[model samples]
Target chain A: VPHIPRGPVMADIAAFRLTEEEKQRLLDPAIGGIILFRRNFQNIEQLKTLTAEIKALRTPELIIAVDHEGGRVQRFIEGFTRLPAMNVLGQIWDKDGASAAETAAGQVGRVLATELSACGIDLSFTPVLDLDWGNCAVIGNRSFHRNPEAVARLALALQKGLAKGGMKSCGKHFPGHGFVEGDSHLVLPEDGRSLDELEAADLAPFRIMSREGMAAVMPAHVVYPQVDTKPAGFSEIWLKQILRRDIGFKGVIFSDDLTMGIKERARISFEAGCDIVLVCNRPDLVDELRDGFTIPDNQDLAGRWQYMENSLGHEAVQAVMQTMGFQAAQAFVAGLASP
Target chain B: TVPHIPRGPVMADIAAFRLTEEEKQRLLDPAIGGIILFRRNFQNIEQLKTLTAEIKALRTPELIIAVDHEGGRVQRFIEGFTRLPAMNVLGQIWDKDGASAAETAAGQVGRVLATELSACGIDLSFTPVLDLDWGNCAVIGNRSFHRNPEAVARLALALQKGLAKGGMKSCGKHFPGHGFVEGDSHLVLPEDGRSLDELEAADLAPFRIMSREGMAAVMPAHVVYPQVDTKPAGFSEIWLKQILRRDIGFKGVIFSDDLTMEGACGIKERARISFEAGCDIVLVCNRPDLVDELRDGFTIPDNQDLAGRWQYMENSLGHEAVQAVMQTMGFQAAQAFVAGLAS
Candidate 1:
């Protein structure tokens, strides 16, 4: 690949031609990755051509990812193998062994990665590591298991599998989101537990996965008062101290959809000292992140990007995916979801 | 001794029966003990209290009034009782936080049963079904924990801890476990085709553990274990006499499953056969004649020998323990739990 370019923006290939402002934004120095949504996907050859066109505009490999967990959250459905929810593996694990569950989870990740990678997608935001908190309506069926260890085992297995298909993974909603009773997509949720209790329950899975070289981590919108003064995504204590220094996760740290209220409270685009900011559908936040110059991209930051690009091309993942299958290997996204 | 008069609605037995003149005089005796209640008998708290008080005062010792207050869909006095989630919720919570689960369960069971029983003056509550769902039976589907005996023992203990706090005793039913059979006891007497070794592995473990710990009473199912004997468990000498009493060493009183069902009459024998076979109390529900026959024929097994049963209850439902469970389970706070019943 070309020399790791600092602060590069990804292009939207679908707009055969861009508006004057959209073209200017694409060439901006601050933008990094372009997350593809359903609107960008049409068919196999069309999507591959779209991805190639987008990559042609960038100097460095831009991170390309999608939310493609199977079960209820799958984005690419038809023309791909139908996948069961993570809970099915959990249910099966209750009767069988963890090795079996991990194997099954890895297979799911590998399948997801192979399919998406074949379509030219570089990464899959996957392996949701939320705990089964019983009452939460949105996260219940989506969680892998009620126990922390089971989720970690299954998540890492999938992550390894995803690496096999030349697709990296991103873990999400770090420090755990399972304890909250309300949906963060609609309302802000404050977990009632102190830092110690959270570490004992929700944070346990993240801690285990940190040692496994989880490629990326996503922090939740919920505020953990005892741990840090801010929500995890923008909290220096969360991103720098806990995730990077303490856990030794020397990988990318992506915040939740920046449009979330908690993200605004963190002043992420203005204050977050991290690599990459995901805006989802929020163009205003993207504009702010692009325009801001308080923190300039440095050589060290560019090195981190190069490290990931090199790791994605490494031979270790191909061997792992050959054994695990791409679908099950994609579950490493859960490990990243933890702190 | 004179032939024991069977319990029912006869003029002779009526004088001995536990119904009030007003209840007996009505077109229907609205207060029978063994027949399970649903959403029908309840209206609100005060009305239920009045109904229960009237029912209890009908005879000398009053009636042995009861209800299946097990949580989940089995709960009857919902409006006036604490809305306990399925008992399986306890299992899930136990996996997450063990101590809180036990403490929470006790409080839930105590508050629910105490409020409802105190309102209705009902004597007993058949609750916390002791069966361990070994993953084979769907009828017992969320009703049980895992197939493991050790986990079931822990949960059953937690339930007993809660029920004691409300001044209401708990009944561990379908003894020797029912979750093994694919058949429902209410509909058919399903056979557990497994041999003795399989039964020990999957079925008998929880019963052995719970019965020895502090179960107040054992209610055997209406199904037969052909491996043990031809007779159904309630009437079988092997189950009631050899296995339960001898092998398991459960000293508590054995309450036979509802006598009105076909499972109870696998043989055409009467209340005499049930009494002679080893069942201390054969419930002849809905049929007053069989009730009288059982009462008259089956001599109350030495009440003094019931020291184990009584001691189990007293120890399990001690005053301090009872109060503790009631507070935790939210039964003390649930006013509408037994909102409406006719005295």
Candidate 2:
């Protein structure tokens, strides 16, 4: 067995089927979880079987995560519930305030969670905290509201709803992504505002929602020069100081795809802190990074991993998970596994 | 002229007819000096030039011919003009770049207005609305820049500068402001109950700032600011004399809005009341009977006939400074301008 750091790290394993040598290699690998993308999905039974086989290989735990924040950004569609654009919910809020819009958004979260967890998914990166600045073309309809207070209030409601459907939620692209004019997916959009402006507008939603229990937070790829010299994901200023101590967000900090433009020319996975670097669609660099460096368990790094443990509802979380799915066999298995 | 004081105002709908043979006869009687133009009178560049030339050739010494040409939904002529975006675009730019954006916008508007009207032989354009959009007024959506005072001040000044480019002066409109009230003046009279202090801070700032630039004309709002004055500012002595003249120190020209508006329908006594209340010109647009009654009453023994007419007509629209800013801004914004003149 290859020696590895005892910390939270995930790796890719298994296709539709794996050989005895392939299965043994994964069981011996030093990672803790598996991430699924479009190619990994088949029908309902095939996916459930594949997840079952993958989970049976791990000892401590393995996180099964997917990017399922609906609207135009939904990942799984073939056998999934079609979700409405977040802007439609925002428009409803414009006509009516918190109570009605929140209730409706909660049900949306429930429906999204129940469908995913039924297929054996662990977390959903949801409730985008970006503000609906009137002019931003991409973030316009996706954001909850232009006002800060509304985004916070509605996000809390959606978080609770996701919990009710037996799935934990990840409040994503933390410290906010709404103010930047350029789309981060294409290039590194720079947010040049002072810390004061971010507090008032962009970071308001994250600051409020972080106090509540959240499963994870994915840092944005944008470089906020005022706040940090590095991109938010790689910056210790964001991951350690603000997200951990100040806002008190004790959740898994999932860096967005490192292979993308935001981190395209950066150093290897060990340098980028990619304990769980997603090499999902392509496989060229998978072996190179896996063999190059051992994962670190530095005291400060261990604390970052420890926070993710506090956020998961491991105390009898499975009973709630059972009720979310229609299949009795899956429900019974999930119920029996409750703490 | 028959000696008579009319009981109330009368208005005619002159939508279809530009100037008939009978209308020409009425023009010579010292009874007509105001005519409103519409799309019917406008066919093409040459035709509109001929029409305005013929109307000016009438027997009246001076006439006020006006059109609502603030662009976007309000623009009457679209084929020849550059078809500028709604006023909301300036505010969007302002939110992005602040004061410089607003200043550039004002110059663009001035060049577009001056070049288009000057080439077409038009005198003044009624523009630069001094209203803060409070979100309730659907008609004024994308018309007023924002709810903020400073944004309105910067953008309105730039627009006024642009209007001066082609020797065209503008009427700073809906005086005392009208953006917050929900009522559309075309349908009914609206009431803005904001106190004098409130009006001075929010609504009246643009008017006060632009007035120093020698804004040649001021048009009073149809809405009644009950807190400030019981009478609508158009007919109120307090607004016209105390506020506009004494406080704001505007000495140019005052033009009454279309007296035929449903909002203007409430006050029964028209021309005499407007004149008595220190209005330089009683517009009496499209109302034949009101025009005849005003002509007869002014020519009668008891009236201030020459004084009212002289006060209204003596304040000519152009000056050298207004002409210079027009040339500078117009030359700067030549590429974006809508050139209606036949080369």
Candidate 3:
């Protein structure tokens, strides 16, 4: 029997409004999620209407998400609270300590998650778990710290805040993307290190985060030559044997955007064990992927994605903003930006 | 319990004429499907036969032994083998003389190449480079048979027939044609920018013919066709599964190009992607250190039935039969062509 794949596709939209073509595309059974960017957002009111209309298009609703990891990566910046980069929290950990840093990190997650949840977005691929290896310019300011222990602790704390804000957290560039100098967005990078070497250094935070129940993981596009020849995103050895089996992770595996120049991105990633694949910025490619590819369905994956949705409303966002926790986080962020 | 058939996708190269302890250990692993021979593995006919016998002794269902003895620049063993002419020599014959005579010459070349290798106990030769001589690709220069698809198809079919006569099988290679690409996949990832329609009309024509005509195996090119897919043909299901398997209806083993090449750099990623893309076996040549890591990391699914294919590829020729093959009319014709090319 030919297996009918119920695999979910995550795609991005052009603007705050959906076109007739865009509306027809959302109705594709393969498309189960929608990702938003700066182009998709105008204001809080526009986002709410856009997201609600998108929800009304189908039963169970399309999963709305964003790369709202704060600082330069934050998509909905104009109407949103100016969230500081994650490196600020890492710097705090250096001076103050783990407990103080965790408190600040949790607030950062809460503010970011609450604002996004109120706007009808389900998930924010936040809390970059890559370490500040100093060499990788792409991950320089985005990473929590050079220390894996600090990154893990702060990332877990951020997840706690996200859960409190009625949202789920996804730790990204798993196993580590900070060590390699080459940005995967341009060319395929190689990390010439053995599995043992990576496990001890860069893989430390991912191990801790997985154990702590990170809701999802996004593998890096960079290849580790000594461990496996392929990039982490398309490696069964990395995804299956190491991440899923060895580490005992049971979360949804979301692949990094297919547009990152990775070859055969959708088919290879889906087969490599990614539950949901993000195909961003290319709606034409999305149609080709939906028409051509076969992605298998896992009921457990469907069940897991449900937890990623926001349970709170705009009232909850207002309530959270009024709290002393929000004020403290606001003040701390303000201090970091001050000269 | 039923006896197990040893089948897996990994195909690696050995260091020298004899097996090392590490090489023996690698052969023992069920995931390792076969071994590819290089010039380094050949000292003489006796040494080649002994090495193959020793490798066979290591496992229950022996490994599939293969080599790039496509003649001319690609031939691995030369000291005790026929000095076979480049495939282009036959193409020139077709251009000057015509199809029937060229077909006969191609068949004779295939017979000589297969018979000698079979006598030395090799199961497969990565041969009959079915690529068209597009005049642009230096890497595929003399390796390709002709510029025309019909000529390539006719000549390759004849060659495959001759291989069968020598108790060997042919692998129609560098599909859907490496001759059109200017860049060498060994140095960098080459892209074939032509549309799918253009490729179907030219490059893929010979492959479709060979696949339908019962070519036992195929090797996909490492070059990417960006118009069809962003990934290389070996790593794309659009090319391998949808086109080669479904559209072309090729029901044969698909061997990937050497993963150590620049075009296939990611050791584990390329191996897994190649296997998942419908390749029955993947080659990781020239790097023993990388091979060990790949063997350890790569996991084979129990459902795959590679053992049957491995058993099917076993050579049926022996020493006396190979000697008898040398005296045949076909061998004499092929030998004359080789001598003509040399002169």
Candidate 4:
């Protein structure tokens, strides 16, 4: 199958199987990928079919993804390694000291991506990357450690493990989401810290990761009023001035799940710095965004899309299934599942 | 009969070569777990053997006899034993000859140390200091494997496997970490201000890896990590319980450093605090009075878990260790091997 040049949308399918219109929407040159949810899953057999059918859509096919951070955030659990909350890892950092948790975090990443990739899923918006500040209910355990350096170290290890698993990793809720109590899914939370403070703590994980050649980052909806009047997802200062110009991030930028802010959301986010805009939760809205949004004439996306693509073929993944790293991952997950 | 470790909460030390009557009486209490030997406890190998034999005869399954036997300045025996080099010598080899060479030397070092110490009737030697050579902490310098956490982890693992081969268990000393803080915990309760992230990258990094690879026991430091808790690591529930056992999943013995050290609270306060904080074995070294004070009053609450962990170490002690050391007669050669690295 010849790889088709992808568009700039990462929308979602509404059920366990794609609808005819969902298939058409995915087939649209304007639609770039599909993010799976629990509502769209039933079991392992169906999960495999869903990914295979999605891949059969076009020549190269759309990038298939899920919000599978494990623990509470995992979209599909059956036939998957039951990853602990990224919180348990922080607890590991708290107790086992530093390196133990670091090792475990990397192991989790490999297992997460390896398992996902084996089923033909290309990526999982994972490693959370946000610092768990004990305040945000939304990010609480989904995030890693409360400390920036800890989050960065663990997230970096996790990202590398994801690469080893033959899947690209995506750091979500960028610059950070842990400090605010409001869930972006519900309300727009505001952080009081200035750009310097975010640079010191909140931005450290994203900053370090971006420099390490992160494949993608999902900008957060939380607004840092001191630094930029708009939410990081919409603020040009955040995506362009800081993330791109300062941190030297050269990866795909994903906007968090939409807003008027939805209409202003995608185009402004595109103008600000996003390479792709995600429209999930409302299928009709997703249908409209596919028509409404178009790849910018000026922006060069083909080069950026190179980072998000999984380079491993079926032979490589199948060979991995019989190897010791996979065996070790098998043993780890088996043990991890038991305890 | 199954070999058993005394479920004593306190691991005390004597002031001289032989066990005094007071120390013997102190052991009679069900609360004394073991004895830690110091430099003063040795006159020669035979005298030390006689002392250990008598001490072992006093109790069923024998009380655990341990020592700080990591070599260099920390070694207690001088006249008779193979002079083991400081771990930094291995680290030096790591830099000069590379990981393979240094790791081999380290394994050999552990083999010789464990076999000789076991031959001397010592139950265990707290070998392989996991602390980093941060170039700042004087107490941990040289004793540490290297300034890098990777080197420390790799070398210490080889040493532990060697120690295990020699029928000894390796106890990773100075839990979480000890090298980053400047002052020694012996004199002052050093405070490490860095968050767990900073420490994890450096000091705690070693402990983190060991907890996975396997460590027979851990000796928590007296340094206070204020971000985690107000008390020192030995007394911090977050360090010993939450981090070590629960998070890192290290289901081994939690040995307390000397309770009499100035870094600790007063003797009595340190004992209960460390005990309650998840320490399975508390050391009351250099102070017989403190041991006596605790002997009469201090009793462990959840000692079943303590006995279980001890048995795990006891079971893991190689049956081959005794034979390996005896058959090698290679003590002198082992000495040369380690001494060569030091030079």
Candidate 5:
């Protein structure tokens, strides 16, 4: 990166390749990036073309993002390695030794990052740092372990492996979403617990991960009414007062894919300290983001994002592929991802 | 409870900090020799101290409480323990600064590594890996000290001397050489096509020298050298009996690496093979069922002298004495290595 100036809004395209309208939508200075989905990925050969076309269209290049946390959550499949759910690691932590679980988590993270980086993707919204409270299905196996210490220890190992694969990691569902029975992707779930209660279990991982190099976070759409009236994504009390002030997180605060009041929510997320606001799955909102979205310029947005770019140069990731560590990494994941 | 007079040759592991009735039965078996610990076995020094004492009470001579606490990635009980760098770091100092500087650093690394494990009542640390860093294997990457045979020998001698000073015993690992093969024994069977004479020139140099230096024990690798034997070194007569014991004149105990590894064959048969091949104590880790599997199946080809050989592995240093003197040893490097909150 000659370090291109990135816009605040992260938008998405429709298909495997960019349509003419998608090209026009992408060229908009207000649109900073694209988040790919299951529809956009057909196979790895097509994945390389789509990511390259998107990059060829811009200067700093729109950041390629995907929700490839592995297991039931991975977007790109077929030729790619099958990754196990985060809960498999939790199961391993309980049944096997903690040392084995730690090693398994590292291999999972490396394969996820290496595969994504191979397709010209920059970041993966990964390592769901949520605790598996066993009460929520939305996060059921996606969560690592219910214990805060295991969650922190396993997540940090995965985060390191991601770096080795030449991709950066993003810890998601800030303040955690595993305890709630309600799914935030469908509706705004309300968590009635106080901040202290949240901190004890749900917030434990985010605090530990934030200090230990979890570079990006996505706040939950769930509202903690006892702490704040607004959902965590829209509340300054969460993104600013608790996350920024209390926890000391300086990296990017990405608002969880805003399936919300489009224009007003985008403005609110930025004003509340979300450096990047994601508007995915709705191409209709791209015009709203392209034509009308405006905010006070924050110079530090791209500066903080510079670290999340793929640091592996040409033939760099291939060297890692041939390593015994990588070979062992694949051997480990094969056992955990097994049916 | 009255202590039993003898032990089995299987150096197995317990599930948790405390023993179960199932574990007590296995401990009492005449075929069970010692205990090999993992991170699952430790909580803190207090918990470790309690656990070791209980295991000691089950037998008159006590089960050998062993851990893979060689520093770096192999370290098992790390919480509140001295953090020692991988052995290769000392080798780097040797290549960069030559003998005296590297030897001294290696001695300190060994001292801190041993003193701390000894304090926790750990009898043996499978450490000071004498394998030359062939730059091919990942499992032995930082664990091996140097690539040059001369450097590996000198550094190991110094490290073992430090272990002796700290009142702990040293066990040199992956006999013949594990650093040349890329595959890991923990996952699959790895083989080396090298001849016996070819191995003695580079890989066997330190093992031959250390045997004379009174290295407490030796653990053979799972790798099979085809020219020497069809079986892996852990279950090979040519490597274990002919080369290591008779030809090389090694007098110490021959501890087998985990029979539970995929590299080794069946559980009952692997134990039988290692015993027949001349291993003094065979380890079965990560699978407690295998411990019972062997418990129901095998019995040792016993010797009263085997217990005395196993006794040499116990740390003469003891716990309380080392705990006080560590403050006075004035190892500034050790303090900086371990004094941090988390490594």
Candidate 6:
């Protein structure tokens, strides 16, 4: 339980090694974790060293996290095996069958989890639950399928595979984000469907994922106006009532990047019931937040975070890659290109 | 509790004297429970009535048209409506002329205020600042009736009586009180570092009286009572539910102050927390973008009980009744006060 430090601040590093300035900032009690971007990774060995060095600076050690959901969002590409986009699996679900597609998805998750865990990464924001309404380019190839049931079936298998590889799963953009047209990174997007319509369609996968034991849930930056006026990331209706109370999701709620165009990003997200927030690519903003926020003592949060810790070491990477499941998964993904 | 209110929780604002095509679309939104008008929405009595009529005609149950007609600096629709003195003036009269005269003045002021607004088709007015004039708070300086809790309570009751007479329900606002705090919640998240016992002795006394008197609604202050809770009173269940609802035994609609204020940072969080804390309707004023965001993001269930309470606030007065109200003693007193100020 005490392996991962408990705090609100989750930040990103600038490069492969810690600058003197970065080390000084990281020493602050508020910073509980660090997320690695492409700039922080030169190769596998360097990534492992960087993660180990980050852990060494603190007693309980910061939980190292990443945005390695595969396809266009993967952070480490050169050393890691090229994972197929989730839509490829969705396509398989449409063609081959549910069982075969789920098996393939589980394999993809195992490979993703094992490779990332081998590099000492604790979590990857993955298994996007957003339903592809064909209207959103931001979620175009990243979503599993347009149908909620298929998305849930495939994502649950993926979560199972991640668990087998000594890693945890975070079902993301909870409730859904695929219906909106705008990219949250650039501008605030909006979804205008009623709550019943959302629950029946976009929310089905998240509801299933929560029951299936998702270690964490990430809310979308997009607003669902028929439901609320704020983005899902800054909404207590979505986070507290819908996710925690109604759906009975007992897990950490990670916010989408605070750097996204939301007003009063850090304070609002925390107050709205986000357990942890991703504030990446802005050290100045990170410093300001670190100084400003007073993280409340939640003893249960430490226990929840412990579930996300990677138990496997880098030495097991070769063995995991050589496994029958990994080989079959790799073959299944590779076969997608042939036709 | 107030009875026969309509469903919906979002209370928004308009940009001008009449509805724009975009504003019309917003008014047509089923989620919009009510509309709060500002100085921008008021050009004259005719304009205000037309706007309110237009909005009311959009839906069957009718939108709850509201305004901040608390007198003095807070009053809207002053050009055609009777200009009333601040509540502090009533307090001053209470100190010098005695409670009987003060109560009469307050009652008169309430009648004129409610009568004029009701005549213009406004259903509710976020009125009778229940906050005490602690003398330290600039924002509540003249808005509050008095420093004495008993005096404030008595004056508010007199005001409510007049409002009821004129067929308008009263809302005792900035509850449990904003008089003790120094900063404006519009600029900063004001903190009242006093204990609940200390607050109950002073600021909360008027609220308790009004609650028992069946105050039609209550608007919680954004100011945080730290000894009671870390969140502002508007967003705290301890203040709203445990104290305001259970202890005070208030059964009326609970409305939230504007979410665009500095104290209310996130639109969704504000709406959710306030509603969870017991607010029947949450106000998102001044920011149409944030209003649009709120309209799209949150899902509120239809509370029939809440709808019943909202309908109780609607005006029952007709044109002849309004003209008759203009000839009343209270209206004449208010008119004289306005004439004196102009002179």
Best by DockQ: 5
Model 4: CAPRI class? incorrect
| Candidate scoring better on lDDT of 2 and 3 | 3
- Candidate 1, A52-106: lDDT as tens digits: 6656656775656776766545555556565566777787688788877887777
Q: What TM-score, to 2 decimals, does candidate 2 have?
A: 0.45
lDDT of 6 at A190: 58
What lDDT is obtained when candidate 1 is compared to the true structure?
Answer: 0.58
Off by over 4 Å in 4: A1-4, A183-185, A259-262, B1-343
Write model 4 residue lDDT over A1-339, tens digit each, in one string. Answer: 545677887788878887787777787777778888766778877888998888888865788887777555666667777777676778788888889888887888888887778777888888788776544544545677779888888888888888888877788778887776431112243687877887788888888888887888988877888888998988899899988899888888888766223555678878888988877667777766666556675456766665676767877887887888777876775465443
In candidate 1, position A74 carries an lDDT of 55
TM-score of every model versus the real structure: 0.47, 0.45, 0.49, 0.49, 0.53, 0.50
Task: Compose the digit string of candidate 4's lDDT tens values, residues B171-204.
Answer: 9978888777653111345667779878766777
Better of 1 and 6 by TM-score: 6
Q: How accurate is candidate 3 locally (lDDT)?
A: 0.77
Flag regions of model 5 displaced more than 4 Å.
Answer: A1-339, B184-186, B260-266, B327-343
Pairwise TM-score winner, candidates 1 and 3: 3
* Tens digit per residue, CA lDDT, model 5, A1-339: 234467877888777899999987887777677898766888888999999998888778788898877655677778888888787788889989789888888889898898788889999988788776543444545788889889988998899889888877788788887766431012234566778888888888899888887789988777788988888878898999999999999998988777444777788888888988888767887686667657547888877667678888648877887889887787778677864
Instruction: Give the Å shift of residue A310 in candidate 5.
Output: 20
Error of 6 at A107 (Å): 83
Fnat of candidate 1 is 0.00
Best by lDDT: 5
lDDT of 1 at A173: 69
lDDT of 6 by residue, B1-343 (tens): 2223344788888888888889887776667888888765767888877898888777768888888777655665667666666677788788999999888877777777787787888887787888886544544655678889999999999989888867788898888888776531113455677999999888898998988887889888868888999988878889989999899898898888554534553688767767887788888776787778777745776576877787788787875788786787856777676444322
Please give the distance, in angstroms, between residue A30's alpha carbon in candidate 3 and its true position after superposition: 48
Judged by DockQ cut-offs, the docking class of candidate 2 is: incorrect
RMSD of 3: 19.3
* Whole-model alpha-carbon lDDT for candidate 6: 0.77
